[PDB]
Amino acid sequence: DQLIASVVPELLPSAELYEDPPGLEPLPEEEPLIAKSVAKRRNEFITVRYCARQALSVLGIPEVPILKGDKGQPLWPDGIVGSMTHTEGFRGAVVGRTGEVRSVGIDAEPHDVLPNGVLKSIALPVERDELDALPAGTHWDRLLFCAKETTYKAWFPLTARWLGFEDAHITIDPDGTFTSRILVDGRANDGTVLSAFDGRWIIDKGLILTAIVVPKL
Ligand SMILES: CN(C)CCNCc1[nH]c(=S)nc(O)c1Cc1ccc(Cl)cc1
Ligand SMILES: [Mn+2]
Ligand SMILES: [Mn+2]
Predict the structure, then answer these.
(1) 113 Cβ partners below 8 Å, 6+ apart?
(2) Could you say which residues bind CoA here (predicted)?
(3) Among 68, 83, 116, 142, which is 20 to 30 Å from 153 by CA?
(4) How far is CA 97 from the centre of its chain?
(5) 184 near 167, Cβ under 8 Å?
(6) Domain region containing 127
């Protein structure tokens, strides 16, 4: 039933909530990150971290703040990788151990057409042709944008570098999989080279969820 659980391996616990339940709070160390934020932002931040802490508890990790790094990236405990996402109708998190996976990224979007002008900004010309050839009945433009955001989220923890929308070519398969081919230097922080990712996608509850797990070497 859960969207994230449907697109990541069993080894990576996940948790998701479709509403902001009443009474949640950030941990004291997290409060400065949203002290001057509007209610919508405070709620997505608090609810997604409740989900992340639930998934971390399944790995045996007790309650811990999840702060943000210089490029907005969540800062996980030592030996943990993870990803978080929030959109209207969805808050979710997924975590894993570094001995079991290299990286994970997820992104949730509403299953709707992209806003005017966004596809032109994010898609390579060949991607635009590819999407037009896919079967009718799915918002392929929104799925491409979702998959590209998941691509940067899986990439950043391994490279500490920017990955623009024009820096990767995503190919969507109607069967619930996609591939991301990196078009820039793929040197990773540990000296390895990243060239391509394998992704999974699902559409349910009016939402698109994309996920990439970069597997153990
Ligand atoms: C602000 N929220 C909505 C998140 C969206 N932005 C994040 C973002 N988007 C794209 S397209 N590519 C990326 O690599 C990054 C992360 C990043 C930022 C800056 C640097 Cl320098 C390095 C990595
Ligand atoms: Mn969000
Ligand atoms: Mn998104």
Answers:
(1) 139, 141, 142
(2) 41, 49, 85-86, 107, 149, 153, 163
(3) 116
(4) 17
(5) yes
(6) 1-217
CA distance 99 to 133: 40
E-only strand ranges, the chain: 14-17, 80-87, 90-97, 101-110, 168-173, 177-182, 196-204, 207-215
Residues in the chain: 217
Interatomic CA distance for residues 23 and 42, integer angstroms = 12
Q: Angle of helix 140-159 relative to helix 125-133, nearest 10 degrees? A: 130
Mutate to test the pocket of ligand 1, among 124, 151, 163, 185 (most ligand atoms within 8 A of CB): 163
Question: How far is residue 89's CA from residue 79's CA, in Å, rounded to a whole number?
Answer: 31
CB of 164 within 6 A of ligand 1: the answer is yes
179 CB-side CA count, 13 A:
8
